[PDB]
């Protein structure tokens, strides 16, 4: 805000960009009923994955 008469307005592109990305990140990772689901390559140890 260099001068009172300079009309010290400020842009918030940074704020909009972060919120736009966040609107999707939580919508993908923290949107489902759970977070992760372990899966095994065989069944006889899949009793541990669940």
């Amino acid at each position: 805000p260099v001068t009172a008469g300079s009309s010290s307005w400020v842009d918030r592109t940074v704020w909009e960009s972060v919120n736009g990305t966040l609107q999707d990140i939580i919508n993908v990772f923290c949107s489902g009923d759970e977070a992760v689901t372990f899966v095994a390559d065989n069944q006889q140890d899949s009793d541990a994955a669940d």
């Binding site: 009172a4 008469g5 009309s7």
Partner: protein, 66 residues
């Protein structure tokens, strides 16, 4: 008695009063000359002042928002 004018610019008063002095008694050519010179002396002063005022290159107007 005195005034700054005489410290600085008396010839002015001289000519300008010669004007009315050369009107009391009819010598009009002298009048024209006195008067022109008075005016040309004078405008110098106002121009001096104008060139003195607003020195230092100010911007046309600092636009204040507030």
């Amino acid at each position: 008695d005195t005034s700054t004018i005489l410290t600085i610019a008396p010839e002015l008063l001289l000519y300008f009063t010669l004007r009315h002095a050369c009107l009391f008694v009819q010598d009009d050519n002298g009048v024209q000359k006195w008067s022109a010179l008075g005016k040309a002396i004078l405008d110098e002063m106002v121009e001096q002042n104008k060139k003195q005022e607003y020195s230092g290159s100010p911007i046309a107007i600092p636009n204040n928002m507030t």
